[PDB]
Amino acid sequence: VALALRHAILPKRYGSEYKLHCEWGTYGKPEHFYTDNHLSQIGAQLGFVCHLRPFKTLNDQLFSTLPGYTGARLTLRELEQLLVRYIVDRYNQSIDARMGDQTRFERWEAGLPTVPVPIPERDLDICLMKQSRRTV
Amino acid sequence: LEKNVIATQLSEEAQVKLEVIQSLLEPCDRTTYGQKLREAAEKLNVSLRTVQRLVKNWEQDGLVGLTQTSRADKGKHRIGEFWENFITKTYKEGNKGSKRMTPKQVALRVEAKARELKDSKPPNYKTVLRVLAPILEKQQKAKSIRSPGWRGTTLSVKTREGKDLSVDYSNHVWQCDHTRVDVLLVDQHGEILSRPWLTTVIDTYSRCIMGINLGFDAPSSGVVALALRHAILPKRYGSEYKLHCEWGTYGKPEHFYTDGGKDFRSNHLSQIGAQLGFVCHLRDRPSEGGVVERPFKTLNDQLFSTLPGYTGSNVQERPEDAEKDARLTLRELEQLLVRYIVDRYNQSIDARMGDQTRFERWEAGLPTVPVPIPERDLDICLMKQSRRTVQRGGCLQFQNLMYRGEYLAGYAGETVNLRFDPRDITTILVYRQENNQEVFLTRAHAQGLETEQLALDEAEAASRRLRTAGKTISNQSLLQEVVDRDALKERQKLEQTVLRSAAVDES
DNA sequence: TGTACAGTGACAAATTATCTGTCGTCGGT
DNA sequence: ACAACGACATATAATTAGTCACTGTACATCTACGATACGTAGCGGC
DNA sequence: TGTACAGTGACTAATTATATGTCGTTGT
DNA sequence: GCCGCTACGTATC
Ligand SMILES: [Mg+2]
């Protein structure tokens, strides 16, 4: 969960290999974060409140169509590329009935009271995985 | 540079502060936020000003701002600098050279100076240990430092010249050094001899053991010449070795990289190298050649520690029964050690790689299959007498022995290069310079000894005895001073007899 | 960038003496 | 009238210096020495 | 029941950087 | 005065 949070917060900066057309432009600290002491520390470290639906479309629009769908081979990295391409150029470019004019990304942008300032990368190190002992 | 800090093991008090901060994450209104502070002052038993300080420490540091920071004096000593420098330098001077002064002894030097200065509070011994503690840990750490290793197929062996040899393929760089084995052996009668010497020749590209010599004999340019011919010539072992794979390893190095021992920095090895065409090189430190030094630990660990008569790696680990519990002769130990090298060691995984055996990597690593050298052309192993001159009557003098040769009377007054075998000096091969090249001349023979065989160390021991006996110099006279000392024992002769019995089994 | 094997923490899988229910049974009131 | 910050005084645990009982480990003949090499000097025979 | 000294945990006294109040001042 | 064989000094494993 902390790794998913780190990604969300930081700028994305994806490689040419994903062959994306659109930019994944979000970044930023929320006011609240809802989840399934560690996450509450992270909330207190970063300054937001921890509390304790794109699945339907991932299945229909991406996964059920892929090699090896569990009712051919596919590596983890390839699946990531497919998933990012789907999210940056299709899912977030879709318009819901409740938005009408604006896409999921556009409404996101459109609704901000202000452009947040990116959190320097180091302040998110608390999210990363850790090995506790190594010898130099 | 970047400067981040992260808290860990937070909870023990801090979870109470964390729950207070979680209750305070938002300035909801000037009316309500003050009430939340005055409520949090029930969970922490402290005033509004303590909770306002906690919130400021949190906002400026994050989670470490909940934890109590260590005092600014932590690791500083209250005794004053004079005593802190006196104690540190006293220790250091007292462990200079061979001196090994203990902290207790440093404390005595502290009480001695304090008495001179009329001090009343010389630091206590317990505080001397504490002041010297950091500079002891450093010493222990500086001994313990690990080094990584060559990783993958690329390896650059450092020489004493500061040049690195890039090891590109099998037989590009062989390496050689010598070790005592850690087992006391016995003669064929079951009496103690001595711990053999083992020589190995390792190819650096494959780490396969390309040859050995095992014997009671001393490191010598002779033992190195024997290790080289065993490494170079194709190998054959009988069924009494019970081998189940073949040591199919042979051919000639391009370079030979060694320690600084007088066996290797010698005119004899240089003459072997110049005739075989390989260049000798000097190992810069005993840690650049782990390719040769680590095989010797593996053999202690995999072979020799499990044999009777084992002596330990040093005198403090010597099994007290080693001198009573010796059983093997040199012929048994070789029959075990050769098996170990052919069936186990050369068939084990090359550790840098993880997916090849040492032999498989050698065989696949040849740039081409080399042609076996006729055993007669391994004569180059012969030692050279550089500049002896032919006497009138077609004669040569060497080691008191006098030699006669089939065309040699044609060259009285001239200079000839004599090639000889330290195992058999009865015969001498004579070469001469012509057109600034060596040309072969003749097989000179010790006159009246054509039916007889003398090794160099026998002619030498006979000459020493003959000099001190005051008798005359002649071919027989030297033979006479051999045959009584032969017929009539001394450990070196007893060792030589068992070593000979192994060489007989090689024929 | 020494080297390579013996020994060692951290973790996953198979096995088992043990903890928890549920009901039946016996004893006390 | 409410919230934030400092000047100052005051109580407080963290760190260090010192004390003392319990305990691990060397004292127990023992590495200067053997075995090569080169490099140079010397003894009498010629 | 070997032996006797250097090093070490468990505890305590001395020193001090630091958290806690109380109130004055400033901003809102 | 010139030249093969011994003997001592120094270095390293
Ligand atoms: Mg050596």
Token duo for residue B195: 């711990």
| Beta-strand runs (E) in A67-126 | none
Do residues A109 and A23 lie in contact, with contact meaning Cβ atoms separated by under 8 Å? no
Contact A44 B18 (CB under 8 A): yes
Do residues A35 and A70 lie in contact, with contact meaning Cβ atoms separated by under 8 Å? no
Q: Is B416 helix (H, G, I), strand (E, B) or coil?
A: strand
Phi and psi based region of residue A100 (left: phi greater than 0; alpha: psi -120 to 50; beta: remaining): left
Query: How far, in Å, from the CA of B177 to the mean position of ligand 1?
Result: 5
Q: How far is A50 from chain B (nearest CA, A)?
A: 9
- Give CA–CA dist B102/B109, Å, rounded: 11
Residue B57 vs residues A45, B20, B62, B67, B456: alpha-carbon distances, Å = 12, 13, 8, 10, 88
Provide φ and ψ at B17, rounded to 5°: -65, -35
Which residue, chain included where needed, has tokens 């409404």? A107
The strand pairing partners of A33, in sequence order, are A50
Distance B326 CA to E13 C1' (A): 64
Do residues B369 and B247 lie in contact, with contact meaning Cβ atoms separated by under 8 Å? no
- Give CA–CA dist B179/B295, Å, rounded: 11
- Give CA–CA dist B188/B496, Å, rounded: 12
Q: How far is B16 from chain A (nearest CA, A)?
A: 12
Which residue, chain included where needed, has tokens 């029964």? B321
Query: Is the sign of the CA dihedral B123, B126, B130, B133 positive or negative?
Result: positive
**Candidates B2, B25, B63; nearest CB to A41:** B63
For chain B, after which residues does the C atom lie more than 2.5 Å from the next written residue's N, i.e. where is it broken? Answer: 488
Tell me how far the alpha carbon of residue B325 is from its chain's centroid.
28
- Give CA–CA dist B291/B178, Å, rounded: 13
- Give CA–CA dist B174/B210, Å, rounded: 8
Token duo for residue B310: 């084992």
- Give CA–CA dist B359/B232, Å, rounded: 15
Q: Is the CB of B306 under 7 A from strand C?
A: no
Q: Residues by CB within 7 A of strand F: list them.
A: B 177-178, 219, 259-262, 388-389, 391, 396-402, 463-464, 466-467, 473
> Residue A99: how many CA atoms within 13 Å on its side-chain side?
16
The strand pairing partners of A34, in sequence order, are A51
Q: Is the CB of B129 under 7 A from strand E?
A: yes
Task: List bases, strand E, within 7 Å of protein CB.
Answer: 5-10, 15-23
Q: Between vectors from CA B334 to CA B329 and to CA B339, what angle results, nearest 5°?
A: 135
Q: Write the CB contacts of A97 (distance below 8 Å, at least 6 apart in sequence).
A: none
For chain A, after which residues does the C atom lie more than 2.5 Å from the next written residue's N, i.e. where is it broken? Answer: 36, 52, 71
Per DSSP, B402 falls in state E
Q: Between vectors from CA B262 to CA B257 and to CA B267, what angle results, nearest 5°?
A: 80
Provide φ and ψ at A95, rounded to 5°: -115, 125
Burial group, residue A8, by CB count within 10 angstroms (0-12, 13-18, 19+): middle
Do residues B419 and B382 lie in contact, with contact meaning Cβ atoms separated by under 8 Å? yes
Burial group, residue A44, by CB count within 10 angstroms (0-12, 13-18, 19+): buried
Which helix or strand (DSSP H or E) is residue B439 part of? Answer: strand B437-446
Q: Write the CB contacts of B395 (distance below 8 Å, at least 6 apart in sequence).
A: B402, B403, B404, B408
Per DSSP, A93 falls in state G
CA dihedral B249, B255, B258, B260 (to 10 degrees): 150
Token duo for residue B467: 């000099």
Do residues B269 and B221 lie in contact, with contact meaning Cβ atoms separated by under 8 Å? yes
DSSP, residue by residue, B83-118 = HHHHHHHHHHHTTSTT----HHHHHHHHHHHHHHHT
- Give CA–CA dist B449/B445, Å, rounded: 8
Question: Count of CB atoms within 10 A of residue B81's CB?
Answer: 8
Report chain B's terminal Cα–Cα distance, integer Å: 72
Query: How far, in Å, from the CA of B260 to the mean position of ligand 1?
Result: 7
Query: How far, in Å, from the CA of B187 to the mean position of ligand 1?
Result: 27
Size of interface A-B (CB pairs under 8 A): 38
Q: Write the CB contacts of B371 (distance below 8 Å, at least 6 apart in sequence).
A: none
Do residues B216 and B192 lie in contact, with contact meaning Cβ atoms separated by under 8 Å? no
CA dihedral B405, B410, B414, B417 (to 10 degrees): -30
Token duo for residue B203: 């190819």
Per DSSP, B74 falls in state T
Report chain A's terminal Cα–Cα distance, integer Å: 30
Q: Write the CB contacts of B4 (distance below 8 Å, at least 6 apart in sequence).
A: A122, A123, A125
Query: How far, in Å, from the CA of B329 to the mean position of ligand 1?
Result: 25
Question: Count of CB atoms within 10 A of residue B291's CB?
Answer: 21
Question: In 3D, which of B6, B501, B499 has the Cα closest to residue B217?
Answer: B499
Provide φ and ψ at B33, rounded to 5°: -65, -40
β-bridge pairing B437-446 and B401-404: antiparallel
Question: In 3D, which of B128, B137, B189, B150 has the Cα closest to residue B329?
Answer: B189
Contact B25 A48 (CB under 8 A): yes
Do residues B156 and B166 lie in contact, with contact meaning Cβ atoms separated by under 8 Å? yes
- Give CA–CA dist B261/B178, Å, rounded: 10
Which residue, chain included where needed, has tokens 């780190």? A6
Q: Write the CB contacts of B188 (distance below 8 Å, at least 6 apart in sequence).
A: B329, B498, B501
Question: In 3D, which of B65, B69, B45 has the Cα closest to residue A41?
Answer: B65
Q: Write the CB contacts of B55 (distance below 8 Å, at least 6 apart in sequence).
A: B21, B24, B37
Question: In 3D, which of B276, B270, B274 has the Cα closest to residue B258?
Answer: B270
Which residue, chain included where needed, has tokens 């690990």? B146
B chain contacts of residue A49, beta-carbon cutoff 8 Å: 22, 25-26
Do residues A29 and A96 lie in contact, with contact meaning Cβ atoms separated by under 8 Å? no
Which helix or strand (DSSP H or E) is residue B3 part of? Answer: none
Do residues B211 and B175 lie in contact, with contact meaning Cβ atoms separated by under 8 Å? no
Token duo for residue B50: 């303590």
- Scanning every strand, the nucleotide with its C1' closest to B395's CA turns out to be F4
DSSP, residue by residue, A5-68 = HHHHHS-----GGG--SS--------SEEE---HHHHHHHHHT-EEE---HHHHHHHTGGGSTT
Which helix or strand (DSSP H or E) is residue B446 part of? Answer: strand B437-446
Q: Between vectors from CA B466 to CA B465 and to CA B471, what angle results, nearest 5°?
A: 145
Q: How was this structure determined?
A: cryo-EM
The strand pairing partners of B431, in sequence order, are B417, B440
Do residues B176 and B280 lie in contact, with contact meaning Cβ atoms separated by under 8 Å? no
Do residues A11 and A26 lie in contact, with contact meaning Cβ atoms separated by under 8 Å? no
Long-range contacts made by residues B219-223, C-beta under 8 angstroms, separation at least 24?
B219/B178, B219/B261, B219/B263, B220/B263, B221/B262, B221/B263, B221/B264, B221/B266, B221/B268, B221/B269, B222/B268, B222/B422, B223/B178, B223/B197, B223/B199, B223/B263
Tell me how far the alpha carbon of residue B417 is from its chain's centroid.
37
The strand pairing partners of B446, in sequence order, are B403
β-bridge pairing B383-385 and B416-421: antiparallel
Do residues B432 and B415 lie in contact, with contact meaning Cβ atoms separated by under 8 Å? yes
Do residues B132 and B103 lie in contact, with contact meaning Cβ atoms separated by under 8 Å? yes
| Interface mutation vs chain B, best among A33, A38, A42, A45, most B CBs within 10 Å | A45
Which residue, chain included where needed, has tokens 């340019």? B221
- Give CA–CA dist B14/B46, Å, rounded: 15
- Give CA–CA dist B405/B401, Å, rounded: 13
Angle between helix axes B125-144 and B81-93 (nearest 10 degrees) is 50
Q: Give the residue nearest to nucleotide D19 (CA to C1').
A: B126
Which residue, chain included where needed, has tokens 């318009």? A95
Do residues B395 and B403 lie in contact, with contact meaning Cβ atoms separated by under 8 Å? yes
Residue B184 vs residues B195, B282, B301, B321, B334: alpha-carbon distances, Å = 5, 32, 16, 11, 13
Model resolution, angstroms: 3.7
- Scanning every strand, the nucleotide with its C1' closest to B282's CA turns out to be F12
- Give CA–CA dist A120/A118, Å, rounded: 6
Provide φ and ψ at B365, rounded to 5°: -90, -5
Q: Is the CB of A134 under 7 A from strand C?
A: no
- Give CA–CA dist A131/B255, Å, rounded: 44
Q: Is the CB of B69 under 7 A from strand E?
A: yes
